[PDB]
């Protein structure tokens, strides 16, 4: 019938709750589905986290060596694990955070930004400094993926998180040379092949940061570009709460919502 119905069926079939938001542009109307509902951040916080660590520091600070230990690694840490003995720079952690969704890298970035103990407060402040008065991070990795459904802790809304990304990539919340670094890591993202990239024809360019956690949490946030360069911002958010703490996340849901979006954004009827 019409787009809210399409999205309703996706939920019925995946046994999942769906949050979608795309801002309006010059020519397009905004797509919103549970866009003002709270959805677990999961690893999607790492994108704006890196903006904060970039905005609040000179480019020179990316070459600062952070030494950590296996004592630190308490979450999925593809890259951190490899560099535990030589230590990683802040550029290298920013990289790990975005491209491999690295949890330990996001944990050290949180500490660099606002101290041990103050890290997540400091992150939510960056959001606040961008007019986001809804989102909040109350815990580091891995605990931030583990709050029950209902719990406002460690959540954001699609409305909220999309607008934060629009600003970072398409607006002026970073100077170009810092902004370009964020985009290049989002564009070299290894973990998002099967979500919003897969709902969007290959001649459209995509940068994203995925998120996954308990209760079937799967999130992707992205900035796409038409073949002529016309940008749009996509946030898709999901949980499959019915199956409990260990419920299966459905990457195919996010490819499917990205397809409805792509379908609205691309067809000129």
Query: Cα–Cα distance between 126 and 173 in angstroms, integer?
Result: 11
Question: Catalytic residues, which ones?
Answer: 43, 141
Deposited resolution, Å: 2.8
Residue with tokens 């020179």: 60
Give, as one character, the DSSP assignment of residue 269: -
Total Cβ atoms within 10 A of residue 135? 24
- Provide DSSP, 94-108: HHHHHHS--HHHHHH
Catalogue all structural domains in the chain, each as residue range(s) with its CATH number: 1-269 (3.40.710.10)
Query: Cα–Cα distance between 89 and 155 in angstroms, integer?
Result: 28
List the helix and strand counts (H, then E) for the chain: 9, 9
Total Cβ atoms within 10 A of residue 215? 22
Residue with tokens 């600062």: 64
Please count the residues of the chain.
269
Query: Cα–Cα distance between 208 and 165 in angstroms, integer?
Result: 10
19, 34, 29: which is closest to 220 by C-alpha?
Answer: 19
Q: Burial, 159: exposed, middle or buried (Cβ in 10 Å; 0-12, 13-18, 19+)?
A: buried
Q: Is 262 in contact with 201 (CB distance < 8 Å)?
A: yes
């Amino acid at each position: 019938m019409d787009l809210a119905d399409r999205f309703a069926e996706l939920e019925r079939r995946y046994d999942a709750r769906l949050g979608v938001y795309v801002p309006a542009t010059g020519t397009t109307a905004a797509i919103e589905y549970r866009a003002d509902e709270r959805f677990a951040f999961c690893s999607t916080f790492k994108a704006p986290l890196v903006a904060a660590v970039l905005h609040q520091n000179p480019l020179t600070h990316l070459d600062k060596l952070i030494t950590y230990t296996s004592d630190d690694i308490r979450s999925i840490s593809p890259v951190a694990q490899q560099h535990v003995q030589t230590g990683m720079t802040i550029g290298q952690l920013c990289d790990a955070a975005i491209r491999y969704s690295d949890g330990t890298a996001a944990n050290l970035l949180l500490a660099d930004l606002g101290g041990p103990g103050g890290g997540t407060a400091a992150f939510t402040g960056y959001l606040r400094s961008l007019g986001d008065t809804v989102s909040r991070l109350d815990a580091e990795e891995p605990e931030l993926n583990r709050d029950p459904p209902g719990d406002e802790r460690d959540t954001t809304t699609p409305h909220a998180i999309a607008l934060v990304l629009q600003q970072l990539v398409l607006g002026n919340a970073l100077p170009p040379d810092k902004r370009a670094l964020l985009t290049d890591w989002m564009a070299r993202n290894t973990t998002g092949a099967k979500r919003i990239r897969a709902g969007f024809p290959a001649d459209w360019k995509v940068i994203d940061k995925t998120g996954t956690g308990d209760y079937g949490r799967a999130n992707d946030i992205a900035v796409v570009w038409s073949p002529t360069g016309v940008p749009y911002v996509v946030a898709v958010m999901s949980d499959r709460a019915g199956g409990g703490y260990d419920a299966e996340p459905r990457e195919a849901l996010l490819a499917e919502a990205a397809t409805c979006v792509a379908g609205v954004l691309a067809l000129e009827h």
